[PDB]
């Protein structure tokens, strides 16, 4: 109110506010770099899916698409970006 030095707010406020209504819009969606229990290879997989996502060639299935963030297949390790 009255004065809010606008352009630079705290990271917390940005995190809270709808990710469209911010200053410079950036997606708050990651790329899970995922590893499977099968082969020793990592796949760059978007945090959301819309697709049942198999591996590079293997029929392992990494992520099952729910409404939002993809719930990973039971026990699969994953990095970030």
């Amino acid at each position: 109110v009255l004065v809010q030095d606008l352009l630079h707010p705290t990271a917390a406020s940005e995190a809270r506010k709808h990710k469209l209504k911010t200053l410079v819009q950036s997606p708050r969606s990651h790329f899970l770099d995922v590893k499977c229990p099968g082969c020793l290879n990592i796949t760059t997989v978007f945090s959301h899916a819309q697709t049942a996502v198999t591996c590079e060639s293997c029929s392992t299935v990494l992520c099952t698409p729910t409404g939002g963030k993809a719930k990973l297949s039971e026990g699969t390790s994953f990095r970030r970006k």
């Binding site: 009255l2 606008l6 352009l7």
Partner: protein, 129 residues
């Protein structure tokens, strides 16, 4: 539809001034808006202002002096004919004296005094008194 953008820019600014915000965020923000703001600045109505280069459309943050009273944009851009100017100023501005009618011309977006001096007029955008 956000049909006119200058209008939108001014409206929010006006609201801010009425409340007593020291700063406004303008959503779409054009060449035209920027030029208008520059004009306002030149006669000291607006403080600093910062155009965010959104890798999209635009965004303007304004600093308000509290020297603003009403900034209006007139609805169609009436083509205006050098004598018409006088009439408009009589209608739109609180004195024969001060404040400005911000008309776009071929020579650029000027106030009205400047236009008169330059001896060129065109369509009107806004005003600032």
């Amino acid at each position: 539809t956000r049909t006119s953008v200058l209008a939108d820019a001014l409206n929010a600014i006006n609201n801010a001034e009425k409340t007593g915000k020291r700063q406004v965020l303008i959503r779409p923000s054009s060449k035209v808006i920027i030029k208008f703001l520059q004009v306002m600045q030149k006669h000291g109505y607006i403080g600093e202002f910062e155009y965010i280069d959104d890798h999209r459309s635009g965004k303007i943050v304004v600093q308000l002096n509290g020297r603003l009273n009403k900034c209006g944009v007139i609805s169609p851009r009436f083509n205006v004919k050098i004598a018409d100017v006088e009439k408009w100023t009589a209608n739109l501005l609180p004195a024969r004296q001060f404040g400005y009618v911000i008309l776009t011309t071929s020579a650029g977006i000027m106030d009205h005094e400047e236009a008169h001096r330059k001896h060129v007029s065109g369509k009107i955008l806004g005003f600032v008194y």
